[PDB]
Design a protein around this ligand. Structure first.
Ligand SMILES: Cc1cc2nc3c(=O)[nH]c(=O)nc-3n(C[C@H](O)[C@H](O)[C@H](O)COP(=O)(O)OP(=O)(O)OC[C@H]3O[C@@H](n4cnc5c(N)ncnc54)[C@H](O)[C@@H]3O)c2cc1C
Ligand SMILES: NC(=O)C1=CN([C@@H]2O[C@H](COP(=O)(O)OP(=O)(O)OC[C@H]3O[C@@H](n4cnc5c(N)ncnc54)[C@H](O)[C@@H]3O)[C@@H](O)[C@H]2O)C=CC1
Ligand code: FES
Ligand code: FES
Ligand SMILES: [Ca+2]
Lengths: 98, 99, 49, 99, 464, 483, 98
């Protein structure tokens, strides 16, 4: 068996659960296997997640600036190269917190 | 009426389950919602109508606002895109009636 | 600045969030003394994203 | 309402209204409307998914069907990229009437 | 020219000012507003951005369909193809069978991975309307799901092969004739010969080369021009390693770089041939030729089983893997162990090299001169008494970086068990692909027995 | 949170454990966040399923220069429980007794108190255990594993069955509250909202099912559009597996308010449809909007007096898993997993089975695949799927069997259900311990003693599996010698 | 709101009803998904109708806070609210009038 190329048998799945009582109304869905209400839209790419929301004409974009050190004092920050990038608006820091 | 702000609606379709959000200069959110829903053929629970403020109404936005809202809601449904209409004063005076 | 990275760094530096949490019941000294066998060990469990 | 910023994909609508007090609509010609840059569509009673009956007492059309019953009766709506293109396209919607 | 023209969901897109840094994903989502295709990683690993590409293959006079990662696909590479997204196959008003079955079988929880999984299954069916259960699982080597535990997705899709939670009898049947037409325009456009294209963005110029002469001339005057075929390395270096290559040349249209030639000694592949083409031709050869002839071929195929997934293998070129020269390339050890023949060309020069230890002189270096390109690689038939194995062990079996990867070959003196040649090559054991050259020469003329096993093991333990 | 544990367990030759001392340490990172509550839950679960008369657990949370660690499905539970299962595995090995017998004989009975003094009422665990032992054919399959191992030197199989007990409720009592707002519009359609957020767990689906039962109208008449702070304020996070419990009750109460308001119109028109009652209530100027609220009663543990109930009830389940390892590479296949889960009377067995499988597969990642790497200076190296390996389509057990326990209503939660989100995750430890069993079989083939307690840290990666399968190859590489 | 100062009056009413300054109370907008089945803003009736609705919603809140007001008779509004929340008492209420 040391020389065998990787190979699996095909899957064999079993899901067991309880039927709802016999005299439960067909409109009473509690305990019945109702599919996720958004499943069809998720399958079709129509379900909207945050970034799928259309942008406003005047909408801006933000990117976080993070530490590359585990523990250190910040002695200085230079934004001169940042300011040269087209579309630059601002760099927010602790000073900017109202 | 000559409310300084004429009739205006923005309809934002949400692309799921017939859901739509309307931002409307109206005195009557309930009928705006009902008339849009009935035109589209969706339940009332899919349609949300929001009003922050109107630049005047004086009764003229109690029902007649809906002639703009429904057309706009329809364009939004059809295109899948937000759609906006503010009436020009000449359009508004012609269409919406008075005392 | 001096960094504390691992659990052992933190233990060696007394770098903790608050005080020791503890649950105890019964009598350990007696429990261990009357056992047939004693087994000790250490386990490490990695985190998860 | 109109101070709310536009979504990047937002469209503009312009209503097209009756110039006759009581008449049959015998044809609508949108040939010119379609030539205006940014033109998307012209909505009429045919585009209504469910009901064209609206108003407080259900005696009003969303869009005129077959006849117009006042000067100002909404026949349809042009959808375009901008309000200027919508106004130009709405001028190119040619309607023929029988009084 | 300089206009970029392609199709999305059957509709013509004309992009007059295409920026080479724009990916298909960004273009679909932000320019076309088609947000069914998701961003999950941007590095080819999750499949959330999977879309289908259709094009007319000029070589084969046939329409082909394959899946790709939209997150890594530059739009400048897509002139005259047709893109299909989740929106192109169906919606809630008329669900495609793929969409209906994943939804109804409870294969969609958070739903963010769902369009990408739908597109991988959809693509499989466009190529194979009746796949085996194994083909179905293989379609998803480059798709991840964090919610479902996979079981319900495979179980729902199993219905496409060959109390209850769902009823497969209520599923609508698949009619493959009802799929979207290949755009007639693109069939009309293939009648016109392709010309060089230039795209200029904020920082990057992209040249889509149409001929070898164009490519070689460009490399002669500008040896800094960066070749891009599938972009599965370059895309990563740009996005994650903050590399900027101001001049890019894409040679993917060039016939010579896409050709498959059967010769006396083996099969030569043009260096731009996608890994999926290599797989499909070698599979055909393995099925029809004697086992004696296909030892090296089956070695390549074993490595390719565990090489990324469908989306990456559709665009990833064989030459891109060789030239990237990562120490953990899964193919270089196999090409080195088999001594595969490489053809190198520049303007005014052509030379051949058998891949050996010298081909890799340093970390991510090859012996290629700045103005040379890799034209082809010949994967050899094995001889009588010549045996080959390929190995890979990573952290996960599927779509992962090898910790150690290996090609191994032995040739025996005819009629005997005495060693004529032995080659043991390894990735992941140094800053380049290496051969165990201190250990193997000692073994020549030895019989293949326990003494040889122990000698090689002791040798490897010392040398590596 | 990564955990380090130092344990000492005292036990009898029968396998009965009589003393347990465990010190836990977690790596909390650079802010406190939820770290101390996570440590509390680990301590609450250091017994897993086992009654231990003399017991001491301590927990300390380390403050470090790393990104702040936080809540993850299980919330300290899987860490506390794996430690329990790890010394328990060593108790069985030391005694020379079958693991499944040692676990069973140490298991709580109905009415026992935990180490934190909460009474185990409605203790369905022995049922999950007996059903899983039986449906998995565990003892027959043990023999086939033994036989495979005799016939194969370089592949080995292992099989293990693992129980679990998981306490349901936020460890901070006041977070066990939920709110809902319901509107009925005049066309009879219902707009519902509650404090819970949809993240794939099918919470809105369950709330619509709940509302539909409560109001006695089809689900098609009820819609949830979104979660918002301006419709339901002061909501607890969607966390602690608690959300269907908490929001279900809130939804139910808002619906009851609406029904009470509609009852005189229902009396006037006993058969007339829902739409008539609603329009009648509207034109009689009756309010068609209601809030609903719920808090879990009688919760609050004290660490000082070791009294008070931290949990409202407990989830129970059992998993049996079989693996086959490749002793030469460290690769393995997950061959078969059988799970039996008590989810009370399930609100939605499709959603609940989906949650068992999803949770199980994340635990499979935790215990066997998923590993984060940092530079000595504390920079995360592992920043994408290329280097962080979550389970793939091919990673899941080949035979994957899940059963929800029958006939086990849980009256104290919405329509007799139980929470399902987190409890099944730890059950993937059955793969971890099946692997450990396979490794032991490989080690015995190299002459390396039975009853030897070799080290297996979590996750049990190919690296850790291969290195633990000591042979002539590892010996040569490590020390330079063999034969 | 159409210029008649209805939101101003409702804040004035709620401030008296809750016995807190107007500065602690905010009305942002009108929406069908916060209050359903509303009559038009018409017939000069809106302050009368909505004022009573607002008054009643405020009375419900005050009734819920009373045990906390009784315990901490001078302690500020913010103390009662945080006490109510941490005792798991609902801080949301509908109000209605006909
Ligand atoms: C998700 C994912 C999984 C992966 N899995 C694996 C794996 O399992 N094993 C493995 O080895 N790799 C793997 N890779 C790496 C990569 O996909 C392969 O190396 C691939 O073959 C690169 O080909 P490409 O056409 O995309 O190269 P590109 O990114 O377009 O180019 C790569 C390099 O080759 C040069 N180049 C291309 N063609 C020529 C030519 N003909 N002449 C000279 N230079 C040329 C380019 O200039 C560039 O430097 C993976 C990558 C991803 C994103
Ligand atoms: N994205 C994905 O999922 C996959 C990517 N690939 C390849 O992986 C590459 C990863 O790139 P990088 O992180 O830059 O890795 P890299 O190309 O620098 O290779 C790192 C590996 O090389 C070896 N190595 C390097 N220097 C060594 C030395 N001095 N001594 C001993 N061993 C040494 C080690 O095995 C190390 O793990 C990609 O470029 C791609 O080609 C392969 C499989 C999957
Ligand atoms: S976004 Fe993950 S592969 Fe493209
Ligand atoms: S359903 Fe959420 S990742 Fe697949
Ligand atoms: Ca923390």
């Amino acid at each position: 068996s040391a020389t065998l190329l990787f190979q699996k048998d095909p899957p064999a799945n079993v899901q067991l659960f309880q039927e709802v009582p016999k005299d439960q109304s067909e409109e009473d869905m509690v305990g019945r296997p109702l599919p996720h209400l958004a499943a069809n839209m998720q399958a079709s790419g129509e379900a909207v997640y945050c970034d799928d929301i259309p942008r406003y004409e005047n909408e801006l974009s933000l990117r976080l600036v993070t530490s590359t050190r585990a523990h250190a004092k910040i002695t200085s920050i230079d934004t001169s190269e940042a300011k040269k990038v087209p579309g630059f608006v601002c760099f927010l820091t602790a000073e900017d917190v109202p | 009426h000559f409310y300084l702000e004429t009739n205006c609606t923005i309809a934002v379709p949400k692309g799921e389950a017939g859901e739509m959000e309307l931002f409307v200069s109206t005195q009557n959110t309930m009928k705006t919602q009902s008339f849009v829903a009935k035109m589209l053929g969706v339940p009332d629970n899919r349609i949300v109508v929001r009003v922050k403020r109107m630049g005047g109404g004086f009764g003229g936005k109690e029902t007649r606002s809906t002639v703009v809202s429904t057309a706009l809601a329809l364009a939004a449904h059809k295109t899948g895109r937000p759609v906006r209409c503010m009436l020009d004063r000449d359009e508004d005076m012609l269409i919406t009636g008075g005392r | 600045l001096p960094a504390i990275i691992t659990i052992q760094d933190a233990i060696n530096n007394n770098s903790f969030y608050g005080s020791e949490i503890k649950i105890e019941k019964g009598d350990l000294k007696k429990g261990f003394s009357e056992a047939d066998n004693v087994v000790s060990g250490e386990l490490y469990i990695g985190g998860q994203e | 309402c109109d101070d709310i910023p536009r979504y990047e994909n937002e469209l503009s609508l312009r209503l097209v209204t009756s110039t006759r007090a009581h008449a049959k609509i015998t044809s609508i010609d949108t040939s010119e409307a379609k030539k205006v840059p940014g033109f998307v569509c012209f909505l009429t009673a045919e585009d209504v998914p469910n009901s064209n009956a609206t108003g407080l007492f259900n005696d009003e059309t969303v869009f005129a069907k077959d006849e117009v019953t006042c000067v100002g009766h909404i026949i349809g709506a042009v959808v375009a990229d901008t309000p200027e293109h919508a106004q130009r396209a709405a001028r190119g919607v040619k309607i023929t009437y029988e009084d | 020219a300089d206009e970029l023209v392609f199709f999305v969901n059957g509709k013509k897109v004309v992009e007059k000012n295409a920026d080479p840094e724009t990916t298909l994903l960004v273009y679909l989502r932000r320019k076309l507003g088609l947000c069914g295709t998701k961003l999950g990683c941007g590095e080819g690993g999750c499949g959330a951005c999977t879309v289908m590409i259709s094009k007319y293959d000029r070589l084969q006079n046939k329409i082909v369909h394959f899946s790709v990662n939209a997150c890594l696909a530059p739009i400048c590479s897509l002139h005259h193809v047709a893109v299909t997204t989740v929106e192109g196959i169906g919606n809630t008003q008329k669900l495609h069978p793929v969409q209906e079955r994943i939804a109804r079988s409870h294969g969609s929880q958070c739903g963010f991975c769902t369009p990408g999984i739908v597109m991988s299954m959809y693509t499989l069916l466009r190529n194979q309307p009746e796949p085996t259960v194994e083909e179905i699982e293989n379609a998803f080597q480059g798709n991840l799901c964090r919610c479902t535990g996979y079981r319900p997705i495979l179980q729902g899709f199993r219905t496409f092969a060959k109390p209850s939670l769902f009823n497969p009898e209520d599923f609508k049947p698949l009619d493959p004739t009802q799929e979207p037409i290949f755009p007639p325009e693109l069939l009309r456009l293939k009648d016109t010969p392709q010309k060089k294209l230039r795209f200029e963005g904020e920082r990057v110029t992209w040249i889509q080369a149409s001929t070898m002469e164009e490519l070689l001339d460009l490399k002669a005057q500008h040896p800094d021009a960066k070749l891009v075929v599938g972009n599965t390395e370059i895309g990563i270096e740009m996005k994650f390693k903050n590399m900027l290559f101001p001049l890019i040349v894409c040679p993917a249209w060039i016939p010579e770089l896409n050709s498959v030639v059967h010769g006396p000694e083996g099969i030569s592949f043009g260096a731009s041939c996608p890994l999926s083409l290599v797989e499909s031709v070698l599979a055909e050869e393995i099925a029809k030729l004697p086992e004696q002839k296909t030892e090296v071929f089956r070695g390549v195929m074993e490595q390719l089983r565990w090489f990324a997934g469908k989306q990456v293998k559709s665009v990833a070129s064989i030459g891109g893997n060789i030239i990237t020269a990562s120490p953990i390339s899964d193919l270089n050890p196999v090409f080195m162990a088999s001594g595969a023949k490489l053809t190198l060309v520049s303007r005014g020069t052509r030379r051949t090299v058998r891949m050996d230890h010298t081909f890799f002189p340093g970390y991510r270096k090859t012996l290629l001169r700045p103005e040379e390109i890799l034209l082809s690689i010949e994967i050899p038939y094995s001889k009588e008494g010549e045996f080959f194995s390929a190995f890979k062990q990573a952290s996960r079996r599927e779509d992962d970086i090898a910790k150690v990867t290996s090609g191994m070959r032995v040739l025996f003196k005819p009629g005997t068990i005495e060693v004529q040649e032995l080659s043991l090559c390894f990735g992941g054991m140094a800053d380049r692909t290496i051969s165990a050259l201190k250990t193997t020469p000692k073994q020549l003329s030895k019989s293949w027995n326990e003494e040889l096993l122990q000698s090689v093991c002791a040798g490897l333990a010392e040398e590596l | 949170h990564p955990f380090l544990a130092k344990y000492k367990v005292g036990f009898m030759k029968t396998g009965t454990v009589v003393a347990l001392e465990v010190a836990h340490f977690s790596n909390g990172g650079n802010t406190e966040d939820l770290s101390r509550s996570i440590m509390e839950r680990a301590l609450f679960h250091m017994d897993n399923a086992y009654k231990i008369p003399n017991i001491r657990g301590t927990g300390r949370i380390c403050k470090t220069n790393l990104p702040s660690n936080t809540a993850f499905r299980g919330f300290g539970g899987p860490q506390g429980m794996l430690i329990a299962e790890y010394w328990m595995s060593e108790v069985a090995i030391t005694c020379g007794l079958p693991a499944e017998e040692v676990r069973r004989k140490n298991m709580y009975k109905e009415g026992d108190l935990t180490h934190f003094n909460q009474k185990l009422e409605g203790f369905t665990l022995p049922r999950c255990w007996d059903e899983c032992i039986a449906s998995s054919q565990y003892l027959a399959r043990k023999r086939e594993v033994e036989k495979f191992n005799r016939e194969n030197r370089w592949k080995k199989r292992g099989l293990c069955i693992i129980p679990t007990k998981f306490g349901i409720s936020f460890t901070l009592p006041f977070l066990n509250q939920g709110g809902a707002l319901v509107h009925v519009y005049t066309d009879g359609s219902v707009l519902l909202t509650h404090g819970g957020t949809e993240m794939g767990q099918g919470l809105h689906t369950k709330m619509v099912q709940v509302a539909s039962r409560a109001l006695k109208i089809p689900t098609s008449k009820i819609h949830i559009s979104e979660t918002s702070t301006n419709t339901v304020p002061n909501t607890s996070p969607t966390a602690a597996s608690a959300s269907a419990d908490l929001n279900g009750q809130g939804v139910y109460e808002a619906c009851q308010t609406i029904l009470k308001r509609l009852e005189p119109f229902k009396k006037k028109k006993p058969t007339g449809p829902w739409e008539a009652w609603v329009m009648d209530a509207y034109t009689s100027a009756v309010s068609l909007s209601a809030t609903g609220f719920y808090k879990t009663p009688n919760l609050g543990y004290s660490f000082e007096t070791n009294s008070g109930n931290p949990f409202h009830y407990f989830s129970y389940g059992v998993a049996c898993s079989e693996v086959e390892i490749d002793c030469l590479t460290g690769d393995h296949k997950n061959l078969r997993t059988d799970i039996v889960m008590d989810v009370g009377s399930s609100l939605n067995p499709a959603i609940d089975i989906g949650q068992v499988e999803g949770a199980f597969v994340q635990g499979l990642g935790l215990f066997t695949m998923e590993e984060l790497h940092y530079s000595p200076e504390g920079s995360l190296h592992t920043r994408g799927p290329s280097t962080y390996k979550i389970p793939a389509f091919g990673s899941i057990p080949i035979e994957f069997r899940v059963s929800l326990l029958r006939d086990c209503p849980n009256k104290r939660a919405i329509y007799a259900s139980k929470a399902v989100g987190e409890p099944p995750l730890f059950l993937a430890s059955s793969i971890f311990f099946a692997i450990k069993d396979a490794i032991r079989a490989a080690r015995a083939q190299h002459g390396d003693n039975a009853k030897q307690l070799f080290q297996l840290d979590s996750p049990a990666t190919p690296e850790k599996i291969r290195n633990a399968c000591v042979d002539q190859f590892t010996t040569l590489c490590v020390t330079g010698v063999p034969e």
